[PDB]
Every structure is written in C-alpha cells, then in structure tokens.
From a paper:
X-ray crystal structures of SamR0483 alone and in complex with hexanoyl-CoA reveal the molecular basis for medium chain acyl-CoA recognition by this unusual YCC β-subunit, prompting us to rename it medium chain acyl-CoA carboxylase beta subunit (MccB). Similar to other bacterial YCC β-subunits, MccB has 3–2 symmetry and is composed of three individual dimers that form a ring-like hexamer. Each monomer can be divided into two domains harbouring two copies of the crotonase fold that pack together in an antiparallel manner to form a dimer. Taken together, these results establish the existence of a unique YCC-dependent pathway for unusual polyketide extender unit biosynthesis.
Given the high degree of structural and sequence similarity between MccB and PccB, it was not immediately clear how the former is able to accommodate significantly longer acyl-CoA substrates than the latter. To address this question structures of MccB bound to either one or four molecules of hexanoyl-CoA were solved to 2.75 and 2.85 Å, respectively. These co-crystal structures were obtained via incubation of MccB with 5 or 10 mM hexanoyl-CoA before crystallization. The hexanoyl-CoA bound structures reveal that some of the substrate-binding features of MccB are similar to those employed by other YCC β-subunits. The residues that interact with hexanoyl-CoA are localized in three regions at the MccB dimer interface. The first region is located at the entrance of the substrate binding pocket, which is characterized by a network of hydrogen bonds between the adenosine moiety of hexanoyl-CoA and the protein. The exocyclic amine and N-1 of adenine form hydrogen bond contacts with the peptide backbone of Ile147, Ala145 and Gly143 monomer B. The second region is the PPant binding site, in which the backbone N-H groups of Ala145 and Gly184 in monomer B form hydrogen bonds to the carbonyl oxygen atom of the β-alanine component of PPant. In addition, the sulfur atom of the thioester is hydrogen bonded to the backbone N-H of Gly420. The third region is the binding pocket for the aliphatic portion of the substrate, which is formed primarily by the hydrophobic side chains of Ile396, Phe399 and Ala423 in Monomer F, and Leu191, Tyr157 and Tyr187 in monomer B.
Author numbering:
A (entry chain F): 175 to 456, 474 to 532
B (entry chain B): 15 to 75, 81 to 448, 482 to 532
C (entry chain E): 16 to 76, 81 to 212, 217 to 452, 481 to 532
Write the structure that this text describes.
C-alpha cells in the first residue's frame, strides 16, 4: 500500500491488511476516526498530522513501514522492495550477479575489532550487517520504528536474505513490545515468501517494567517466539555478544529451529547476569559466574555449532546459506495456528 | 537378591516419591495458601484415571524423584487429557534438564494421540544453575506449543508466582487461567525490576491476577480459589473437541419447539430511546441452551462479550457487542479479545454466532497512536479467514466499519438476520432501519426478535455440513 | 579484552584440530591406520569441509573436544555431502551422548537438505561408562538410518574394528565398504565366541565380502576404499527426488566392431560358457562399470554403469560361475540392489542367461523359497524403467524372475540364441531352443541380432525417461524376510 493523500475511515482497512504500508511526507495521514470527531467526543483539538501524520505511524503506532521524503522517494522504495521479493509464494525470488570475493577482506577483518573491550561500551550492529551483505547494502523495514531492532532485506551471493538483528545503539538492543511485533511480522512475511532469515543476536532479554507488563509484553513479546518456531525457511544465527534468557531463546537459537548457529568469542550465553547471584545465594561468587561470559558451555552441549573468529562471519554465513537452498521442513496439519494477538 | 526384595524396594521408592515428598510439599504450600502439584492433578482429573509417567526421573549429578514436576495422562469427564503440574517446593518450580524432558514427553504424547494438554504452573521459570540447558528445554516446550497451536487445545492454570519461561509458554497456549491472591505473572519479578531498573513495585501491581484480567489481557479468567479455576477449566474442555479433526461433544437438550415467554421477552428488550441501553447478555441467554454460557475474558474489554454455549446440544461460539460498557463500540482491547477467540474457534471447528450492536470505534489520540488500525484489523482478518459456519443477528446499531467487521455477509457470514431496530448505514449523522440492507440482499432476513432462537437454531443445523476452501499457503501474514 | 578472547579461541582451536591430530596420528600409527580427519580430507573436495560441533564435550566430571567423532559437511565432486568420522584414539571411538548428538545433528541436517551421509567407522563399540545412555544414542542413530532409507543415499566405511552396537548403523545403510587388514565387523567378538577363533576369521573383510554378504566392497587400502565411495556417489542422485548426474558421452551412431563382437560371443556348444561381462561392457559407455558385491555370489553381476551419459543399473546372470544359476546368495544380492536402485529412480537393465536354481538340501532347508522370492518381489515392486536382454538360457522360474515382461519389464528383447521354455532336455522324460514361441505370444517384444543390443537398449532407455507408475497405497509391503 502507498498512502499518498488522506486515508481515513473505511479507506484504512485494506492498507492495514497488506504487508507493507508506505506513506509520503506532508501529503498523507491515516486514522480511523478524524480530528473533527476527536473534538466533539473528547474535547481535544488535534490537527490531522498530530493525530495520524506519517511520523506518528512510522515512529509511534508502527502502521507505516516507510515514509518517503517525496512521492518519487516512496515509489522508488517500493520498486526496490519488489526487487527482493518473489512474485508469489511458489515461484523463486530473483537471483542477481554478485562481486563477492573468496578471500578475507579488509571489511571482513574489521569485525575482529568491532566489539568493544568494555561491557559498558556498545557498537552499531549496522557495522556488522553491512560487512556480511553484498555491496554492504540493505533495504531497511521500519527504520524509524523500534530502532533497538533492525529488520532488513539484502542479498548474499545474489540471493535475497532477510536480516533480523538486535541493535545495541538504541535502547540497549532490548526486546520490548514494539521490537517484538516489528520483527515478528517481518519474519512471518519472509517465511511466507520463502526468504531465509539471518539473525544477529545481542540481547539482554525482554524489557521488564510496569509499562511493558501492563500492555502485555507476555502475549505481545512472545509473538516473536511463535514467528521463529513456526518458520520453516533456512535460519542462520550469528551471536555477537550478549545472549541471555528469553532473548537468546527467541533470537534464532538452535532449539527454536535455526539451521546453523555460529558464535563469536564475545558471545555470552546464560540465563541471566549480575541478577543470578541473588536469586541464588540469598562478588567472588560473581566472577565465578563467568563460566557463562563465553560461548563455550553452549558449544559444549552442541547448542551452537561453531565458534568462529568474527572476521570469518561473511564467508561462513555464505556457505551456510548455500548449503540450505534445498531445505524442506514439514508443517503441522491445521487450518491455521492461533498465534497470540 | 530375592525377587520379593526388589518388589519391596520398588514399594519403598514409590513411597519415597509420591507419599513423603507430598507431605513435604503440603507442609510448605499450605503455609502460603496453596495446594500441591499432585493435589491439583487430583482435583482436575477424574478419580482413579491418572497414569503418572516419569515418576522416577532424576537429575544426574539432593536429586529428588521427578526433578520438580509431576506429569501424566488421565481423563476429564471421560475424555482423555494430558497434564503436568509444577512442584514449586523443589527449587522454586524451576525447569532443569530432567524436569523439561518430562514436560516434553507428555507434550509429544498429546500431539501423538490428539488430546488436550493442561499445564499447571507454579514456577520461577528456567533454572539458572543449569545455564543454557534450561533455556534450551523451555525453548523446546515452546516449540511444541507453536506446533500444537490450532491442533490440540492447550490450557494453562497459573497457580503461583510465575516468571520467565513459566509465563512465556502459557502465553502460547490457548487459555491462561489465574487464581486470586496466590498467583502472579511477569517476565521478571519486582525484586529484579528494582535492582536492575530502579522501579519499586509490588508483585500485585506488576503482575497480579487483576492486572492481567483487566489491563493486559493475558488472563482469560481469574478463579476465586484454586477449585474455582480448575472447575472453569473442566467446563471449558466440555465445549471443546479433543483436537482439530475429531468432532466436539453433543449433548441432550430440552429446547422448546415453539415460542416461549423467554422468546417473547426479546420483543421488548430494545429500548424505545436510542439514548438508552440494554444488557446484551439478556439476548444471549435467551438464545443459548438453558440460558447458559462460559464467558472468556469476562473482565477484559467489557464492551464485547466472548462466550461458549450450546444450541440444541452443540457447541456454539458467541461474539457480541455489549452496550452496557462504552456503548458497545470497538476499541483495541475488544478487537484483540474477539479476534483471537474467533481464530481459536475456527481452528477447532466451532461455529460463531454474532450479536451486533456497534456504533463505531472508540475515538482518541490514545486509540490511534497505540495502533487501532494495525490492531483493530485483527478482528476483520479473523472473521474473513474463518471458514466455520457464521450466523449474525443484528439487534441495533450497525454503522460503517463496525457493521462490516461484526460478521456481516460481505466478510463471510453464512446467514445474516436483522431485527426491526437494526440501523444499517454508513453512519448516523429514515435510513435508521434495516430495509436498505435487506433490499440489496446484504442481510438475508428481517425477523421479529422473539423468533431469534428459532431461526438461529435452524441455521446452525443447516450449516453443519458446511465445507469451505482455504488459500494454498504456508500461513497468512495477519497483522501483529 | 576482545583480542584476548579471539586468541583464546585460536588456542582452543589448535588444541582441538592440530594437537589432537598429532596425538591421534601417533596412536593410529601403532595399527597402520589413518586418522579421522585424514580420511575426511581424502574423501571431500579440498577446502570444502565445514566442521560442526568442534568444541562439544561430554558433561561428566579427560574431556577432549569433539568427544571422539569429527562431523560436518562438504562436497564430493562438487555435490553436497555430510560425513562423520570416528576417532578410535579417544575412548576407543565408543559412542557417548555428546558423540551421539554430533552424529544425530549431522544426520538430521542431511535429511533436511537431501544429501548423502557417509559415515567413517572405527569404533570400539559403546561407552560402558555412560550406561544405558550409550545404547539410547545408538538406537536414535539407527532410527534415523531407517527413516532415511530410500530417501537419501547412505554409505558406511568400515576402517577399523566395528563390534556390537557399532555394526547396526552400517547394516542399515545402503552400502558397506571395508578395508583389507585393518577392519572387522562382528556382533559378538572373538573372545566371547569361549571358542578358539581370531577376529579376522570371525569377521574379517574376506568373510563379509565372500560369505556373509555384509560388505559390498573391500578396498586394498584406505585410499582405494574411499576412492570407490567417491565413484559410487558419482552414479547416484543426491536424494529420492532430484535427478542423478548426466555426463557427456562419445557413443557411436552406427555399428562398431565392439557391437559386432556380440554376434560371436555366444558359443556354438550349449555346454560352453562365456563371460557375461563381455556383453555388459559392450553396451555401457566406455566399457566401464562399478560392480557391487563383486566377490559375493559371483553367479550374478550387479553393477552401476552409464548409457548415453545416464546412470543405469545392470543385473546379469554370470555363466562363468555355477553356470549362472540362481541361489540364496545371488537372490539376496540382486534383490537389495534392485530395491535400492528403484528407491533412487535408476533404470534397471537385465541380461538374462539363467538355467534355473542351484539344487540341494541346503538350498531348501536354508530357505530358498522365502529368500529366493525376494528377487521376484524386488523386480515386481519396482516402477523404474526395466529393459531386459535375453542372451541365452531362459528356463522356468529363473526366466520369470530375471526381468521378464510379466514381472514388470517395459521392454524385452531376445537374442536368437535365447531358449525360452519351461524346461530343457528334461521334459521328454529345436522345439524350445529359440525365442520364437515367446515372441509369437508377445512375451518378448523384439528378436534382435546381438550386434543391435547397444543401439536398441539406448533407444528404449530414452523412450522411458518420462515413465510414471502409480504405486499401491499402503504403509509398506510385507516382503519375505
Ligand atoms: C516458551 C517460551 C520460551 C522460553 C524461553 C526461556 O525459558 S528463557 C527464561 C528466562 N528466565 C527465567 O525463566 C527465570 C525467571 N525467574 C526469575 O528471575 C526468578 O526466579 C524470580 C523472578 C521468580 C525470583 O524468584 P525468587 O528469587 O524470588 O525465589 P522464591 O522466593 O520465589 O523461591 C525460590 C526458591 O527457589 C530458588 N529459585 C527461584 N527461581 C529460581 C530459578 N529460576 N532458578 C533456580 N533457582 C530458583 C530460589 O533460589 C529459592 O530457593 P533457595 O532460597 O532455597 O535457594
């Protein structure tokens, strides 16, 4: 759906059912009930752009996956979007030529230093994604909504690949209601259209708090679990750093259905962190607790398949994706499932 | 050495595992006002029907038998179910390796023979000392929740302080039932919320039963005590099939073949004034067998009613705008309540009877910025996707998108009948009657209200052999 | 620090793949064997091995990385393949839980993408110090072998001892390949058997290649065994849906001298025999074929060849041994060959010269009726194209079983030397010394001059590539076991 003008009332139902809603700056707005009614019933004066302008839907409500600076911008974005997708759920996606190089490159080697020494210092997960994707390029879905998670379409050796990656730049990469629902519907769309999911994991868990709990992060945050566990496309997961609790479970772990899971030496897989010591012995007993600050216990049990040097990520991801193009997984027999709403 | 010695040794281990550990558990749980895992299974299952599996399962390297959970199968009112129940007294109900293997075994069994699973939860989630392994096992339980979604009914009893995986797995089941005063749900507890985020809150305010039943929607019902919640679950199962292929139970019925006084009472249930309201529950009770129904989400989004009842002994799902709260308009919560209820019922082949009196959507910056478009449209999708029989009775207001959504003929309803007080139009600013819609065939009948029960029942009988074609797709992409 | 972590990873990695390889080589030196990783590198294309579960360890507390088996995926001649390789030096190569999960991960992955599994076995048996858990994982592995059967090609290399539980998974795979001097297989070992037998008389390579039939090939050394498996995979599809490889060919459009030789390969005296391999090599591309079970039941030939570049299975009676009669061992050898090929959509070319069954009290009491009928079953159940070429003798039940028209064959051509009959010079107790009665009734489609065989087989094969046959609805049949 391109929203290129007013979109109110009955006019909003079809776009909300389509898979992508793209709005145009200044000239477009969406709401069910218009600001005239918000006055007569609420006694509040709102403009149309205050109530449902493009920024509201791109940053607060999530109804819009992209806002074009102008109409040509929006249409161009849709063209590029279609160029990653298949025509339907049976035919294959386009395959493009590629200038991928056999050989470790300077971009590959930068990953060895991208992770900071200090736990209190973060990084820009986009620095990782661009090193792995062809020409360092990707079309980002919901770029201004829930910026603590990145959902994007790119290509590896010419083949469409979906990317779900926690982003530690913003909100600590945590999983909250918005990040869960943003990533969850992306995965389900890609799984519907046979696009494999590459996940870059660096998660502290779900965001707790009265605010998150009272709006239903239990039923709303778990939607991303359902999405991954239902999906049957190939799934490769690269664990960069933190991997705690429900975060590690949900972000494409092996038990949720991932086909290949590789970890960097900075990956830290455990149930909690400095929170455990205390449901457990009601500060030496704290640094004893880095039997966990590494991936080697999970590797011991086979829960990750590889511990790789970061500079090797692109090259292993590419081989992994190639090894899975013939994947075929069976599905439950049902009219449909009953995902939480 | 002797065979008789080995049998006696078995008897000693059985006493150790089931009798003495039970008195340990009753000791501690009773001091907090709770029952034990085995007590709860005994209330739930038919007497004598419980077959326990994995009695002597132990952690590997105190290692009590069972590792903290009781599992097995039994029958509830004569039909088979599987069950697990957490023992909170063993390490806070946490899931280790053995614990988890037990839960995955009874889940695989239920998927194998196609019967419901009832999980009884009283746990602090994954066991920290076992590291990634306890995350692994909770992940595998969840994976079986998803692969069971729409295949076998899954019900969660929450009977204690539940955090982490013990709130995540029930959120994938079809129904979550909490118990007053003794139970909680939250992704992590208040002590951790404070030590990590500087938020000071009690358990009751962070995730007590009332919070989840009225504010978040996580809980479909809150029992007054443990027995009330278990009875609510047993009644729920009595409306549902065992899986998505076998048929739902049919009961004897004493429905009356002709007009009764309860039928006639419907002619005067709609007030003369458009300004005055009525209790939709009076309309529902008039149509359902014995005027009876089990209400889902009774305290959440009370402007809509979701309920299970019967007509002529067959299970029927009821979705109905409720004028006695917010005038029966739709908002975010009522859309998500009714959407998932409909999708569940369609998954298990329960027909949907809809009572429509919807003036439109609740306006405000709140509704709009929290995503009424993306979230209210879930109810549209749920209706349009369902293939079960659909009967809609329009009682009064019928405006715009609200009319479209609430089981109209254009979204898929098989039979749509209107009362003379139905106002089917694009808005209200006559046209304040149902005859324009009837003129186009958008509603199939205009009936006197007393004739509702007679006509709903005939329509249901007429649609039992309904069969509808589905899209060829892995799955849809419903808005989340 | 991040760099210290990356160095710690390099240290763990060298401990796991280079130090352990030095240790493993010194110990496999005491027995004349290669190491797990050396075999993996001989098998896979250079640079294609992706190793999984490098840093797996058992949980108890000497806990070496990998728990005694190297697993991963690679390619062979460009096509994807999975592999596991037992390390006999750690724990005697015995199976524990971590060990078992590595092979189970490698197996579920090949089932997932549809590619062959080659398992390189060199295993004491089962780790008694993990109790029932060792047996559970053997059973889980075998179970995967059964559900893969006829889905993905499975090949086992026996490159060391193989006793007890270690012998079941190879037995469930499609081909077992042993190595001279270094390898064994036995359910029960020589010590318990107490009898006075050595390991190589109880279950050495010759025993399984020539007497029990457990081994489909024995390589003179490890390099030969592995080279044989590489050649085998080159004839096969990756799984039961995708096609076998097609190669280019230099075949002649007309009659050659190698074709004309077939006119004179059948001797004038009916007592005199010939080498059936002379007919087979005439017909197949380059005169080449990979023989299966070459030292077992030599009275029948089972081989993989090519015709105009496409894979073809050959089943032929061999008059140079036992006159080419059928017995228990030739029936079971050919039956399982044909059922494997049918699983994997390889057409079956039969060369028939069968005078009947080998008679005796041992054939009867050892069960020729239910073991000989396995070959009848295999032919009759197969749906793949079947072309049958009858060179000489064609008597009775042997004629019926060996690819006849009525058992399912799509095309039967007879040489003029073919004698199709209920019997030979035994009934009275040039009437039946020809095929013309069968041809009269339509039981053979063509009576050809032997020189025409290659050309007519190639034609017919091409004519049947789009063949399709509906198979019964049933969980499975009940073939006699
Ligand atoms: C299906 C979806 C996928 C699922 C993915 C996952 O599983 S990821 C899940 C991620 N994490 C979790 O599920 C864990 C969340 N749970 C917690 O953080 C905590 O347990 C809590 C918030 C409930 C706080 O519990 P408390 O510390 O208050 O303990 P409480 O007073 O209730 O009684 C607990 C007794 O048992 C211990 N105990 C409590 N919880 C424990 C636990 N999770 N692991 C180990 N031990 C625990 C306590 O140490 C104490 O024993 P002693 O005092 O005698 O020693």
């Amino acid at each position: 759906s391109l929203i290129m003008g007013p979109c109110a009332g009955g006019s909003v139902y079809s776009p909300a059912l389509t898979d992508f809603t793209v709005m145009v700056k200044d000239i477009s707005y969406m709401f069910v009930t218009g600001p005239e009614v918000v006055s007569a019933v609420m006694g509040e004066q709102v403009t149309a752009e205050q109530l449902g302008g493009p920024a509201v839907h791109a940053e607060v409500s999530g109804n819009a996956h992209y806002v074009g600076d102008d109409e040509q911008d929006a249409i161009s974005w849709v063209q590029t979007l279609l160029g990653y997708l298949p025509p339907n759920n049976l035919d294959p996606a386009p395959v493009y030529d590629h200038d991928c190089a056999p050989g470790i490159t300077e971009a590959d080697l930068a990953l060895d230093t991208v992770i900071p020494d200090s736990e209190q210092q973060v990084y820009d997960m986009a620095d990782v994604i661009t090193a792995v994707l062809d020409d360092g390029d990707y079309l980002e879905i919901h770029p201004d909504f829930a910026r603590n998670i990145i959902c994007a379409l790119g290509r590896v050796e010419g083949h469409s690949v979906a990317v779900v990656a926690n982003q530690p730049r913003h909100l600590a990469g945590v999983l909250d209601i918005d990040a869960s629902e943003k990533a969850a519907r992306f995965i389900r769309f890609c799984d519907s259209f046979n696009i494999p999911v590459l996940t870059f994991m660096d998660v502290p868990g779900y965001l707790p708090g009265v605010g998150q709990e009272h709006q239903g992060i239990i039923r709303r945050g778990i939607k991303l679990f359902y999405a991954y566990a239902e999906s049957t496309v190939p799934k490769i997961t690269v664990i960069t750093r933190k991997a705690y609790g429900g975060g590690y479970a949900v972000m494409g772990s092996r038990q949720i259905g991932a086909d290949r899971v590789m970890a960097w030496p900075t990956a830290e897989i455990a149930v909690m962190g400095a929170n455990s010591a205390v449901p457990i012995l009601h500060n030496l007993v704290d640094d004893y607790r880095r039997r966990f600050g590494n991936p080697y216990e999970a590797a011991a049990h086979g829960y990750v398949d590889m511990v790789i040097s970061p500079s090797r990520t692109r090259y292993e991801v590419a081989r992994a994706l190639a090894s899975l193009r013939n994947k075929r997984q069976a599905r439950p027999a049902r009219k449909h499932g009953n995902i939480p709403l | 050495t002797s065979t008789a010695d080995r049998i006696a040794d078995l008897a000693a281990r059985h006493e150790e595992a089931v009798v003495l550990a039970e008195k340990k558990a009753a000791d501690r749980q009773h001091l907090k006002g709770k029952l034990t895992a085995r007590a709860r299974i005994d209330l739930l299952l038919d007497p004598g029907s419980f077959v326990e599996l994995d009695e002597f399962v132990r952690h590997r390297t105190p290692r009590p038998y069972g590792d903290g959970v009781v599992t097995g199968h039994g029958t509830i009112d004569g039909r088979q179910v599987c069950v697990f129940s957490h023992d909170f007294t063993t390490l806070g109900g946490s899931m280790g390796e053995a614990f988890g293997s037990k839960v995955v075994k009874i889940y695989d069994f239920a998927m194998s023979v196609g019967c419901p699973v009832i999980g009884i939860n009283d746990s602090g989630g994954a066991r920290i000392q076992e590291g990634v392994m306890s995350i692994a096992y909770y992940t595998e339980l969840g994976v079986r929740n998803v692969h069971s979604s729409g295949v076998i009914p899954q019900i969660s009893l929450i009977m204690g302080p539940c955090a982490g995986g013990s709130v995540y797995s029930p959120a994938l089941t079809d129904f979550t039932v909490m118990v007053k005063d003794i139970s909680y749900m939250f992704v992590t507890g208040p002590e951790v919320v404070s030590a990590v985020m500087g938020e000071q809150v009690t358990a009751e305010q962070l995730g007590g039963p009332a919070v989840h039943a009225e504010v978040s929607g996580n809980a479909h019902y809150v029992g007054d005590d443990e027995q009330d919640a278990i009875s609510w679950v047993q009644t729920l199962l009595g409306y549902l099939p065992p899986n998505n292929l076998d048929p739902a139970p049919v009961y004897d019925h004493d429905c009356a073949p002709g007009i009764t006084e309860a039928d006639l009472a419907l002619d005067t249930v709609i007030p003369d004034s458009e300004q005055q309201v009525y209790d939709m529950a009076d309309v529902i009770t008039a149509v359902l067998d014995d005027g009876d129904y089990l209400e889902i989400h009774p305290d959440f989004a009370r402007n809509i009613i979701c309920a299970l009842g019967r007509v002529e002994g067959h299970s029927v799902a009821v979705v109905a705008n409720q004028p006695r709260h917010l005038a029966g308009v739709l908002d975010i919560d009522a859309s998500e309540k009714a959407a998932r209820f409909i999708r569940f019922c369609d998954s298990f082949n329960i027909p949907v009877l809809t009572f429509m009196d919807v003036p439109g959507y609740l306006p405000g910056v709140g509704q709009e910025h929290q995503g009424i478009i993306r979230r209210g449209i879930k109810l549209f999708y749920a209706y349009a996707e369902s293939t079960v029989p659909k009967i809609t009775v329009i009682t009064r207001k019928a405006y715009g998108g609200g009319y479209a959504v609430m089981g109209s003929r254009q979204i898929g309803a098989d039979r749509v009948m209107a009362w003379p007080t139905a106002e089917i139009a694009v808005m209200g600013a006559r046209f304040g009657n149902p005859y324009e819609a009837a003129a186009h065939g958008y509603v199939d009948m205009v009936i006197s209200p007393s004739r509702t029960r007679y006509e709903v029942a005939r329509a249901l009988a007429s649609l039992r052999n309904k069969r509808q074609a589905r899209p060829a797709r892995k799955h849809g992409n419903i808005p989340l």
